[PDB]
Amino acid sequence: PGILGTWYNQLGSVMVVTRAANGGFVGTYESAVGNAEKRYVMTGRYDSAPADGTGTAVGWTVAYRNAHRNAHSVATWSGQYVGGSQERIVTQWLLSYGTTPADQWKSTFLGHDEFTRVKP
Template identity: 35%
Template sequence: MGIVGYFLPMLICAAIPVQSLSRNAETALCQTQEMQGLCALSGKWRNQLQSEITITCKKGTIQGLYDSTVGNGAYDLVGKYLQVNETDYIVGWSVAYKNQHRDARSTASWTGVFYAAEDIIKTQWIRAAFKNPEDYWSTFTTNQDTFSRVQSHPCLHNNRN
């Protein structure tokens, strides 16, 4: 199975609102091989500026969407995670700010820690925007975000990992 075939079911399921699935459809979807073994980060998260990430993670890889309150629509998100103990994770993901509505000629990467006891992801991020060489000094912006869980992935209730 190619990489698209592997991640497509996870991306589709990450984008399906839990309310739109009947209990039988949710159970059937969660019993597929693609949905087995999801990590505890899977679901929808919101930061202090109301930007949202919807992610699915499995076998060390994060896939999903980033919907910025200052951007136009959602952007693909890809990353990695490491489980550091029974409940907590080190995480990192990147977004290229180009979609069907906008090309901001920039990327951003977040790195941080998921604290399960607080159900938050605390991150530091850096954004690089294309500038001409004489303006290179203004290429980078850095800050921090704290993401709080809005909704767990529906399959986490059916198969905990």
């Protein structure tokens, strides 16, 4: 797959893929912004047989509660791994907070992250 190890997005966040096999992967995520500190568990999936000439579809989930802090939010990234230098993971993400039924309408943020091997 080629995603093993450390990645950095344009915010200085740190994604560490510690294991990847059979279309699934695991690791840690450390966000440089927002209500977060130290590392959070990360689990995701990837296309283990990408079509020739295309990127490798990926996706992963991060619940932003560790033993130090809980923002009560879950983020998910969806995009594709693009090989050949510059290698990059281009994503769009959803950040959803647990809310009351009256506040569901404002429960989800949307953004996009670009991950690279070298910290920007």
